[PDB]
């Protein structure tokens, strides 16, 4: 191994984010696990930038977390269409090594699992102002065991015993 970052040199990467969410299904999703299963197959065929893949996965997870239903999701009105939108700034502790620089470029994702609709704006930030922890954007209302909830999106997490999860790596060569 090299001497700069031997194997898993932990680093913090501040970055802004933006997200648009739209999930359709024959029937409304009952539990969070069904939503994650219906969302996790968004990157079946991946075309966008590779350097933002882990961050795209985490933003997809947080969008799955905040899937506020629409009035059409009621008993029997129409096809249940979900929606979510999360904006702000955050830093992700990860051990994936140095990541290539990121630019402000929106990236849509339209893959069926119903269908999906994404708009990521994961870009760099050079400001010194402190930003909230990215794993902390997920409210404790959902994700009873957030390790499994965030792990079946392709991620693998590990508690640091301090309360801030660190991203170890994604699924093999994803």
């Amino acid at each position: 191994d090299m001497d700069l970052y031997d194997k898993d040199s932990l680093r913090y990467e501040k970055f802004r984010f933006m997200l648009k969410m739209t999930v359709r299904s024959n029937k409304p999703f009952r539990s969070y696990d069904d939503v994650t299963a219906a969302v996790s197959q968004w990157d079946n065929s991946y075309i966008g930038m590779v350097g933002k893949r882990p961050f795209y996965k985490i933003i997809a997870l947080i969008g799955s977390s905040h899937l506020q239903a629409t009035p059409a999701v009621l008993a029997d009105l129409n096809q249940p269409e979900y929606y979510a939108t999360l904006t702000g700034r955050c830093f992700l502790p990860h051990r994936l090594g140095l990541i290539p620089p990121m630019f402000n470029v929106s990236e849509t994702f339209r893959k069926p699992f119903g269908t999906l609709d994404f708009t990521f704006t994961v870009s760099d930030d050079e400001s010194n102002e402190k930003v909230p922890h990215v794993w902390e954007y997920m409210n404790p209302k959902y994700q009873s065991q957030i390790q499994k909830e965030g792990l079946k999106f392709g991620l693998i997490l590990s508690k640091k015993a301090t309360g801030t999860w660190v991203l170890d790596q994604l699924s093999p060569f994803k």
């Binding site: 760099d124 050079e126 400001s127």
Partner: protein, 339 residues
């Protein structure tokens, strides 16, 4: 600071100079040959060199203005922002609406090749970048950038040469027109210098050709003698050498050169003798595909009066010059040599 100052059109020169230093610390660019100039060891045949490595750096003594910093700008500055800041010097050096508009279009085209969005920053009115040329440190930075990218032509950031190319050979129109005369005739530079006359062009040549100036070295500090602050009054300017500039421009015009029709006529200098010498040289070149004393004796056989054949040659060389702009050599020749 510089981004929001450009957007609001109230930027400070200290802030833009500091940002230009900060964003132009590209130590990359490997030399291959020694770059000594004026007895200064800039580099030695294979050492990495930066833009500001060739100029001594000190700390400014003054009060720093506030600044209007925007914290939502990513690290996409070095790609296109220093190029724009250096180009707004040449753009502001025009002082004429049409040329300024054309240069702004060219600068926008150059910048849009990199980032592809480039919303124009400086407001359309109240151009504030004219003052930037007055400051000395900004000129030093722009000239250093120009020379560094002139040595390293194939650099990735060589596009910064736009806007700073005007700094090359700044206020050196006399040497430029000497080179133009030497090139447009095909006659040797050692032989053309004998042909100059009127005893004022001789003095201007003498003050131009000091041996210890190394004016024949491309990778030297000479072309930026006034931007680096080496000389406050350039001896190679067209205002300190008006007689030779006028004579050379007229001679090149009479030899059918497209360049010698926009240079402006120098003010308050004796023209008749200069015009006679220029006509003699032009007729010698255009009718004899060149010795100076032979033509001087031939002219003395006419007891120093142009022949009608030489006036006909000048008429041919000056006729059919459409769109001559005022106060230039072309207009003067069309008024006097096209009777």
């Amino acid at each position: 600071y510089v981004y929001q100052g450009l957007k609001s059109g109230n930027v400070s020169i200290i802030h833009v100079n500091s940002y230009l230093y900060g964003a132009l610390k590209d130590i990359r660019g490997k030399l291959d040959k020694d770059w000594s100039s004026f007895g200064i060891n800039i580099g030695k045949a294979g050492d990495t060199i930066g833009i500001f490595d060739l100029v001594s750096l000190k700390a400014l003594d003054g009060v720093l203005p506030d600044g209007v910093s925007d914290a939502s700008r990513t690290s996409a500055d070095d790609k296109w922002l220093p190029l724009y800041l250096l180009g707004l010097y040449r753009v502001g050096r025009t002082q004429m609406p049409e040329y300024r508009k054309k240069l702004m279009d060219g600068l926008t085209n150059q910048c849009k090749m990199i980032n592809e969005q480039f919303e124009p920053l400086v407001p359309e009115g109240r151009d504030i970048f004219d003052v930037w040329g007055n400051d000395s440190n900004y000129t030093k930075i722009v000239a250093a950038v120009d020379m560094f990218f002139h040595m390293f032509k194939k650099h990735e950031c060589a596009s910064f040469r736009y806007g700073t190319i005007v700094s090359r050979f700044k206020d050196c129109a006399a040497l430029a027109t000497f080179g133009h005369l030497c090139k447009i005739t095909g006659m040797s530079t050692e032989d053309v210098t004998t042909w100059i006359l009127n005893r004022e062009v001789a003095d201007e040549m003498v003050q131009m050709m000091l041996p210890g100036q190394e004016i024949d070295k491309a990778d030297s500090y000479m072309p930026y003698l006034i931007d680096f602050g080496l000389s406050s009054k350039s001896p190679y300017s067209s205002v300190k050498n008006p007689a030779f500039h006028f004579w050379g421009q007229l001679t090149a015009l009479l030899l059918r050169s497209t360049r010698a029709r926009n240079a402006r006529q120098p003010d308050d200098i004796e023209y008749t003798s200069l015009t006679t010498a220029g006509l003699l040289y032009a007729y010698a070149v255009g009718s004899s595909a060149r010795d100076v004393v032979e033509w001087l004796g031939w002219f003395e056989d006419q007891n120093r009066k142009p022949t009608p054949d030489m006036m006909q040659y000048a008429k041919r060389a000056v006729m059919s010059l459409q769109g001559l702009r005022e106060k230039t050599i072309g207009k003067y020749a069309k008024s006097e040599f096209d009777k």
